[PDB]
PDB file of C-alpha atoms (C1' of nucleotides) in Angstrom:
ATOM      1  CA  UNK A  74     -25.592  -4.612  -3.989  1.00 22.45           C
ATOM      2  CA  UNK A  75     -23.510  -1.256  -3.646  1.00 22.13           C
ATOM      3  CA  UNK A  76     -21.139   0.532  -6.081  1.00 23.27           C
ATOM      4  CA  UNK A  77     -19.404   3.147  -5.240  1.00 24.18           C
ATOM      5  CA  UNK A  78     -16.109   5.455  -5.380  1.00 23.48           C
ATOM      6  CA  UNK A  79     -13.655   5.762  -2.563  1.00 22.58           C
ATOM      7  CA  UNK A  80     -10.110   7.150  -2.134  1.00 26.90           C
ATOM      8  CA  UNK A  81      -7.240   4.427  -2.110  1.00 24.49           C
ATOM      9  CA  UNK A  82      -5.761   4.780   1.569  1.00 23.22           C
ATOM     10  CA  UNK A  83      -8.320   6.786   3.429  1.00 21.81           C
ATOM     11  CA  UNK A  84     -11.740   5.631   4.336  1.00 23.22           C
ATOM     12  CA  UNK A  85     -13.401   6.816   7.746  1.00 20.03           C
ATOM     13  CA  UNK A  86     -15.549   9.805   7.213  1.00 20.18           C
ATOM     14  CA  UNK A  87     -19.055   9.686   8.543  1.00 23.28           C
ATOM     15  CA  UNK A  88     -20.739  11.578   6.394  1.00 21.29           C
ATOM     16  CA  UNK A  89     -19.603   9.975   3.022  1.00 20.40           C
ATOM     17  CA  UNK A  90     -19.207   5.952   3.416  1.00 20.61           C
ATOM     18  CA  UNK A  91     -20.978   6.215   6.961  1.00 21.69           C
ATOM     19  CA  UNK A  92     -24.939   5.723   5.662  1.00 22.73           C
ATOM     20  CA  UNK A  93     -24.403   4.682   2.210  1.00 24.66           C
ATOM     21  CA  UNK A  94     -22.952   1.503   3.499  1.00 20.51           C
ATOM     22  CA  UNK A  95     -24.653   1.804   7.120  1.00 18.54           C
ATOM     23  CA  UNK A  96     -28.177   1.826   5.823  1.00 18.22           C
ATOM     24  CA  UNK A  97     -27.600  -1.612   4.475  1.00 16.69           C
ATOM     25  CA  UNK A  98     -25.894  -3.053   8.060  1.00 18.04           C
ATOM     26  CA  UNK A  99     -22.615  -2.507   6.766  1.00 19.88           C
ATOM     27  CA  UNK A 100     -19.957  -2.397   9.406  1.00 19.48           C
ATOM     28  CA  UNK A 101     -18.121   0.834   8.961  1.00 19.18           C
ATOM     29  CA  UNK A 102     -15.403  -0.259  11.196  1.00 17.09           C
ATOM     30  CA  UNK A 103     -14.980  -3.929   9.276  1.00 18.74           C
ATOM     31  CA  UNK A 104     -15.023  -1.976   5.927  1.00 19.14           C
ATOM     32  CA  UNK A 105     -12.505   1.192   6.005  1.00 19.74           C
ATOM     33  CA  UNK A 106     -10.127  -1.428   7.451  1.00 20.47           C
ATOM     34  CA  UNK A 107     -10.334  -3.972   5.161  1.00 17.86           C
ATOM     35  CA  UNK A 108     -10.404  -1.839   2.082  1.00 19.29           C
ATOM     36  CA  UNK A 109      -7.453   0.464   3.433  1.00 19.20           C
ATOM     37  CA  UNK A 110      -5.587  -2.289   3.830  1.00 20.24           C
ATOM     38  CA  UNK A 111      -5.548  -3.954   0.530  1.00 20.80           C
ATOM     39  CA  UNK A 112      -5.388  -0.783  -1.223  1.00 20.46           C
ATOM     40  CA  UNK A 113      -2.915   0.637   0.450  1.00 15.96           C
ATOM     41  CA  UNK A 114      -0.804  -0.390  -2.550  1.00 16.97           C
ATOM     42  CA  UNK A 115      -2.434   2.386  -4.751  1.00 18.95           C
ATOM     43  CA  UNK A 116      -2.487   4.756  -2.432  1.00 21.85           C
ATOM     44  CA  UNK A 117      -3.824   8.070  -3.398  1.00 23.35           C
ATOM     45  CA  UNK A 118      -6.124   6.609  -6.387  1.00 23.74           C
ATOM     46  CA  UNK A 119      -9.291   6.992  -6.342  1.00 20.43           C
ATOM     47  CA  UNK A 120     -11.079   3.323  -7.679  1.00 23.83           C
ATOM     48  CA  UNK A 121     -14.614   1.661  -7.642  1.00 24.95           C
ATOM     49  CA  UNK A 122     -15.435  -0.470  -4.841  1.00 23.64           C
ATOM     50  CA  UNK A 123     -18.092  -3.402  -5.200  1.00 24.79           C
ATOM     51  CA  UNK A 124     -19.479  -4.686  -2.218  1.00 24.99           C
ATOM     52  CA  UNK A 125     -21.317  -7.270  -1.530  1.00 25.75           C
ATOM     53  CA  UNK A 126     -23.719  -7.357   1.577  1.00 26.74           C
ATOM     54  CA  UNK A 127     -25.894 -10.411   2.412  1.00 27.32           C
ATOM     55  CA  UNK A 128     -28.290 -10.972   5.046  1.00 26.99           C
ATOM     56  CA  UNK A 129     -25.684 -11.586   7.315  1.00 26.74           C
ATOM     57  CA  UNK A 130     -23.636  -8.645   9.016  1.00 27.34           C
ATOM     58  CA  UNK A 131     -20.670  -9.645   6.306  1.00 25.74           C
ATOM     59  CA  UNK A 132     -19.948  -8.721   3.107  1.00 26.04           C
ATOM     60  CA  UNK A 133     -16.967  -8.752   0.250  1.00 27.03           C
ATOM     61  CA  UNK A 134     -15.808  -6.126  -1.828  1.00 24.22           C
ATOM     62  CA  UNK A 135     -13.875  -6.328  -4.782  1.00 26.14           C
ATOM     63  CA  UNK A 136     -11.703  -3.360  -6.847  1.00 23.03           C
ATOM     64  CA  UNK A 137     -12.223  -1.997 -10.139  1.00 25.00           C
ATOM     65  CA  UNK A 138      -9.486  -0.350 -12.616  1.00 24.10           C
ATOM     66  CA  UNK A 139      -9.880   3.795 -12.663  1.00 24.33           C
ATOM     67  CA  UNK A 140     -12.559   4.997 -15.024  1.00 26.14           C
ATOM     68  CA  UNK A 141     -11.982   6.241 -18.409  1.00 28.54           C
ATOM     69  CA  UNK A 142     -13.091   9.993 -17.776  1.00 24.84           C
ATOM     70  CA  UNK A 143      -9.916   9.845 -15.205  1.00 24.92           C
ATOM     71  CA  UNK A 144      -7.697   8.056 -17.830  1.00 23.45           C
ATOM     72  CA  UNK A 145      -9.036  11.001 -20.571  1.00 23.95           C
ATOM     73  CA  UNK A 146      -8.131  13.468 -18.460  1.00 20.68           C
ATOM     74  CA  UNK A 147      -4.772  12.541 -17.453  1.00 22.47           C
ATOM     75  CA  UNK A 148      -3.851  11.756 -20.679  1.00 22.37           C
ATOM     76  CA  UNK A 149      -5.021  14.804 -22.488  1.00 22.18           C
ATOM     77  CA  UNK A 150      -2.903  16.659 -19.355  1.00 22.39           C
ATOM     78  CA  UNK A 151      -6.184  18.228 -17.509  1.00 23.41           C
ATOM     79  CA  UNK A 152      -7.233  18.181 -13.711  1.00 24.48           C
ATOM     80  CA  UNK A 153     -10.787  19.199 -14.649  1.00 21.93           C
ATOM     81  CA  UNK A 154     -13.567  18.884 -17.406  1.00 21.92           C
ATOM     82  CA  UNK A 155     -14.696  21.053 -19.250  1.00 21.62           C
ATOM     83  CA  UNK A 156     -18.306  22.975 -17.709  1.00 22.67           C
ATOM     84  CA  UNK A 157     -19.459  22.937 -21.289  1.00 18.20           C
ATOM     85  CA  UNK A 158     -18.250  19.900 -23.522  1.00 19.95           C
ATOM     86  CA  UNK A 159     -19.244  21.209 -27.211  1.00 18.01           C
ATOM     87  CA  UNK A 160     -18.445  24.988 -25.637  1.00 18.60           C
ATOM     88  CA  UNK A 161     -15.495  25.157 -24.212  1.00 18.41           C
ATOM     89  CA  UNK A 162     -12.364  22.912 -26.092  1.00 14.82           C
ATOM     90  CA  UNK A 163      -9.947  22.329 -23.496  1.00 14.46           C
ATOM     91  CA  UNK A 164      -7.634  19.439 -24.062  1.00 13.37           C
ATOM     92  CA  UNK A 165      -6.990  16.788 -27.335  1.00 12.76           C
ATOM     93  CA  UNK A 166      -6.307  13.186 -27.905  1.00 14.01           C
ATOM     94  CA  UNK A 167      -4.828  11.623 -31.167  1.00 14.22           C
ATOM     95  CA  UNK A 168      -6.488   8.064 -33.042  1.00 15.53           C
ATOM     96  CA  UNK A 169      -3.134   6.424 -31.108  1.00 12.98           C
ATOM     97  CA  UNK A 170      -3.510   7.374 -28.053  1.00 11.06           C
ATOM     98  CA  UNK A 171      -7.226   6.519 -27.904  1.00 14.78           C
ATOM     99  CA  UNK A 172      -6.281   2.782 -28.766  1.00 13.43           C
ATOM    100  CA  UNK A 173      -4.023   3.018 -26.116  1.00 14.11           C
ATOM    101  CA  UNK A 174      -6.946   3.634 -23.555  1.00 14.19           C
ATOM    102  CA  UNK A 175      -9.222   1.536 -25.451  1.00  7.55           C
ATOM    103  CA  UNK A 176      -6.655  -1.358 -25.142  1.00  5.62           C
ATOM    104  CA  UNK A 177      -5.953  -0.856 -21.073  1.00  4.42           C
ATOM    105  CA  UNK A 178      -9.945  -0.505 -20.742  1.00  4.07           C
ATOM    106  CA  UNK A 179     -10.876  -3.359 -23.370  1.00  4.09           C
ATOM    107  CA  UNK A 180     -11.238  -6.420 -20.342  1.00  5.67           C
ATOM    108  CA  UNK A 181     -14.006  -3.820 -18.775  1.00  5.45           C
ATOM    109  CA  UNK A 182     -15.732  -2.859 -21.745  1.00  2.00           C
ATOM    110  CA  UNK A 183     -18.473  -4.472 -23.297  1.00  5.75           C
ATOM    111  CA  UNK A 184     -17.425  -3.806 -26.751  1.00  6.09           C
ATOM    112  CA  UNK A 185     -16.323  -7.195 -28.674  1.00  7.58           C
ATOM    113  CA  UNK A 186     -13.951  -5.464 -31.680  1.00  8.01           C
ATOM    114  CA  UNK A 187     -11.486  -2.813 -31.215  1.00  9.71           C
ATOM    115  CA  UNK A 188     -13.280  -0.304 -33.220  1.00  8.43           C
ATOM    116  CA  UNK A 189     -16.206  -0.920 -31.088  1.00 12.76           C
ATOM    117  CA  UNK A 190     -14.018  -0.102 -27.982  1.00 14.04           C
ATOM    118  CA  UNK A 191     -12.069   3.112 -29.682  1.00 11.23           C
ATOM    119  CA  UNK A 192     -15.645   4.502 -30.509  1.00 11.25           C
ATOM    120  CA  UNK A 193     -16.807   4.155 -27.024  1.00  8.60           C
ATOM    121  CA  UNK A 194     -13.463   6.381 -25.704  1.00  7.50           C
ATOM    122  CA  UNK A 195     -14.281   9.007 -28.528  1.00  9.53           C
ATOM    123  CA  UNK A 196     -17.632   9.496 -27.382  1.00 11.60           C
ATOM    124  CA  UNK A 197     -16.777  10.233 -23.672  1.00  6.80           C
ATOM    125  CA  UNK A 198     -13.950  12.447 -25.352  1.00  8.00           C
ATOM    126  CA  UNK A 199     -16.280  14.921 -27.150  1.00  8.63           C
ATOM    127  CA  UNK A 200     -18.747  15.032 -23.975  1.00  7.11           C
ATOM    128  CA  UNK A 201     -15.856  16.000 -21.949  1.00  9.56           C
ATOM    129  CA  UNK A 202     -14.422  18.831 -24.043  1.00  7.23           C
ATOM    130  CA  UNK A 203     -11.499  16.707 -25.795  1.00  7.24           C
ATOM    131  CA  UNK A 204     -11.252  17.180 -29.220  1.00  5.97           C
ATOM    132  CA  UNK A 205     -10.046  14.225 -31.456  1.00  7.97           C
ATOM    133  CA  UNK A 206      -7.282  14.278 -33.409  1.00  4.61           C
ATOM    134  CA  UNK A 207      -6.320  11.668 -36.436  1.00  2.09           C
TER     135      UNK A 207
ATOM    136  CA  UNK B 295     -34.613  11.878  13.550  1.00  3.95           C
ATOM    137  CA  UNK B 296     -32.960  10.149  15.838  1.00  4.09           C
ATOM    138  CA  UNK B 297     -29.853   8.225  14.251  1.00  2.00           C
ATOM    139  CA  UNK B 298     -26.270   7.722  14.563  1.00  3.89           C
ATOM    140  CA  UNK B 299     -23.726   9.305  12.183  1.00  3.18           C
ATOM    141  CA  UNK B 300     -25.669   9.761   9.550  1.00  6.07           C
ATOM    142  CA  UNK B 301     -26.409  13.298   8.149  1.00  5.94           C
ATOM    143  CA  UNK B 302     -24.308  16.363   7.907  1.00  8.09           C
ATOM    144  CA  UNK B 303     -26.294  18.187  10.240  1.00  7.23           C
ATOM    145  CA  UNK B 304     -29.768  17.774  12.211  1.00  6.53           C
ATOM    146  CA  UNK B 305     -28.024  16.395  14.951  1.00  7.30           C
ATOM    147  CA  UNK B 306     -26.329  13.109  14.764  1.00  8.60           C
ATOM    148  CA  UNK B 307     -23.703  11.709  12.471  1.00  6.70           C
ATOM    149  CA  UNK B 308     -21.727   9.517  13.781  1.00  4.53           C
ATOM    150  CA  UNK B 309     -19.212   8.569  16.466  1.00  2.82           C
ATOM    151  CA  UNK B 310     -18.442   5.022  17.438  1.00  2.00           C
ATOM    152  CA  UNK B 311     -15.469   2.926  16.071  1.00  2.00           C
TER     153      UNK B 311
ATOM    154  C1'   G C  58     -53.765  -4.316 -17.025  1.00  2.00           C
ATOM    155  C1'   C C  59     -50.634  -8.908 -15.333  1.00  2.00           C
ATOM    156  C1'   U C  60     -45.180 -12.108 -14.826  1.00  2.00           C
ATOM    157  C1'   G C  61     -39.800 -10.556 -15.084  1.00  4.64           C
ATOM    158  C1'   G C  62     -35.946  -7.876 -17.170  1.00  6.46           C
ATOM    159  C1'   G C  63     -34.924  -2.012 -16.074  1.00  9.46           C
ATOM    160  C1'   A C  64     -26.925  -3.321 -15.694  1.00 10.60           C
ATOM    161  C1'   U C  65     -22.601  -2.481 -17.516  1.00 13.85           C
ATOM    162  C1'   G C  66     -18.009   1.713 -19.800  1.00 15.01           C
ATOM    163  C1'   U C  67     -18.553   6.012 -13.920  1.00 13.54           C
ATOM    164  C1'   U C  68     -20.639   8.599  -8.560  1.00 15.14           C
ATOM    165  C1'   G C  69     -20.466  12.256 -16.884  1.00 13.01           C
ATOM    166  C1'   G C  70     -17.052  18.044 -15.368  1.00 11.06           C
ATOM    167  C1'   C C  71     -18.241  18.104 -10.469  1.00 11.11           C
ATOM    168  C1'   U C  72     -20.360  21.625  -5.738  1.00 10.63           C
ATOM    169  C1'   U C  73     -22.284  21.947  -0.993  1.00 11.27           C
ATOM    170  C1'   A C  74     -22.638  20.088   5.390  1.00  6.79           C
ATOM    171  C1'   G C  75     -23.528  15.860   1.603  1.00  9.99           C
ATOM    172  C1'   A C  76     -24.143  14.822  -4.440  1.00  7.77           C
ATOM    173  C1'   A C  77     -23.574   8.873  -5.524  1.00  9.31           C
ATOM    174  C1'   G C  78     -29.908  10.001 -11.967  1.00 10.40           C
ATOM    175  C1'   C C  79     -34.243  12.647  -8.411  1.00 12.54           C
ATOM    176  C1'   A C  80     -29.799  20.464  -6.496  1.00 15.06           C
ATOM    177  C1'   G C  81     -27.008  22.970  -9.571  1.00 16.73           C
ATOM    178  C1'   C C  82     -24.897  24.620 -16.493  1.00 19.32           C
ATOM    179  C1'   C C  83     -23.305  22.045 -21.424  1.00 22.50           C
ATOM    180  C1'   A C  84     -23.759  17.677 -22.136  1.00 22.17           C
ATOM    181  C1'   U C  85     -27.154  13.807 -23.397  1.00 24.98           C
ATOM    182  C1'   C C  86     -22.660   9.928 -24.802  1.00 23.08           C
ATOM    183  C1'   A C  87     -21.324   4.130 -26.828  1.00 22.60           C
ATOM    184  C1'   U C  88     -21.643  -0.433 -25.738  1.00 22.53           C
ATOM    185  C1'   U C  89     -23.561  -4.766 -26.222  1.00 25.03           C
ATOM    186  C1'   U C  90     -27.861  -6.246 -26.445  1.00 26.09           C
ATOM    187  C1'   A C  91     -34.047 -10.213 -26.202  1.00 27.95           C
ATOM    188  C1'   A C  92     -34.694  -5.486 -25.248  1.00 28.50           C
ATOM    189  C1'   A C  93     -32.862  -1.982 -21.976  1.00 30.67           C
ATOM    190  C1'   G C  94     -33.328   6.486 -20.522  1.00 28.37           C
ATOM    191  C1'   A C  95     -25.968   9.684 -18.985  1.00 27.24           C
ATOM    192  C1'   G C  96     -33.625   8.625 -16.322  1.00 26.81           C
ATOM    193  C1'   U C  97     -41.086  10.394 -14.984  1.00 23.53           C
ATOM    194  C1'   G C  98     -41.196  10.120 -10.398  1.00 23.61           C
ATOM    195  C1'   C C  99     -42.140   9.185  -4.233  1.00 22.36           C
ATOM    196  C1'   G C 100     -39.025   9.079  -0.661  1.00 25.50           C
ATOM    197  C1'   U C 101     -34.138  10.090   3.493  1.00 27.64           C
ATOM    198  C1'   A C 102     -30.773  15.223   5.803  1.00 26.82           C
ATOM    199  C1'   A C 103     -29.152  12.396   0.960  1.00 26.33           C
ATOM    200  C1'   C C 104     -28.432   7.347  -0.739  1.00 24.76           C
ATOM    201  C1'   A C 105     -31.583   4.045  -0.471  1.00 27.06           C
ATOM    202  C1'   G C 106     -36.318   1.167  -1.210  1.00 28.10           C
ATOM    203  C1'   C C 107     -38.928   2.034  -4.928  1.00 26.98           C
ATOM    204  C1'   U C 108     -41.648   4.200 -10.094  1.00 26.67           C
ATOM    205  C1'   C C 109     -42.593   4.255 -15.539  1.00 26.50           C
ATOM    206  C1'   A C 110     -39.941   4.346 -20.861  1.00 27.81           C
ATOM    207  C1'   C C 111     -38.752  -0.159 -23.360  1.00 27.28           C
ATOM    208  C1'   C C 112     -38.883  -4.891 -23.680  1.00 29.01           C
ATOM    209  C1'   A C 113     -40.181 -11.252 -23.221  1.00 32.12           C
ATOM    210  C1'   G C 114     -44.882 -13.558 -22.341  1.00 33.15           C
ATOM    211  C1'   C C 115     -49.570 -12.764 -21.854  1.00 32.01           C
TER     212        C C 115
END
RNA sequence: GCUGGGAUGUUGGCUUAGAAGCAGCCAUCAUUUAAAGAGUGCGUAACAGCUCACCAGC
């Protein structure tokens, strides 16, 4: 199977989606439709798409929430990362707000009690540059 | 080598659709 | 050595023509796990397909 990370409302490009998905009889043409039709309702977000290719020249794909390192930096209020995490503090997130993410994240993440799921978001905070704040 | 869209530059790339 | 796991939270911030471990600098996280690398590698123009670490059995 293929996972992979294209931009709500335009997919087309050769280079990019064109062998990735080609190399595994993929039709292109099938695919940038089909995917920029259904989400064409989040336009302009960029979400995981799983597809599913069989033997058969068909497949399925299915759509994914946005990742937390998006959700981090949104919510801290930064476009881009830091180049060096443990460097270079950029932006900061408070104990609330990373329950916040932890709760809109919890149906995708494997953790099974809260605290297990706000630990997860703290340690892709402090490899990102966010410092936490209680 | 010899492809179709496929690369970003040898030759080929893409073009059908 | 042999039989099968070797994914998920993402394609970590991202840059080039392209970047989606195998280019590039800090990072190097945590899950949950039976146990499982933000990975030793071949390979495509990259992906891939595939390789060990580890595990379950032997």
């Amino acid at each position: 199977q293929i996972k992979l990370q294209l931009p709500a409302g335009k997919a087309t490009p050769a280079p990019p989606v064109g062998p990735a998905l080609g190399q595994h009889g993929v039709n292109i043409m099938e695919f940038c439709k089909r995917f920029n039709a259904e989400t064409a309702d989040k336009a302009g977000m960029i979400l995981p798409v799983v597809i599913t290719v069989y033997e058969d020249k068909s497949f399925t794909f299915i759509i994914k929430t946005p990742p937390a390192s998006f959700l981090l930096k949104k919510a801290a209020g930064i476009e881009k990362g830091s180049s060096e995490p443990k460097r270079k503090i950029v932006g900061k997130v408070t104990r609330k707000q990373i329950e916040e993410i932890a709760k809109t994240k919890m149906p995708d993440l494997n953790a099974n009690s809260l605290e297990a799921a706000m630990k997860i978001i703290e340690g892709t905070a402090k490899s990102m540059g966010i410092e936490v704040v209680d | 080598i010899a492809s179709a869209s496929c690369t970003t530059x040898i030759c080929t790339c893409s073009c059908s659709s």
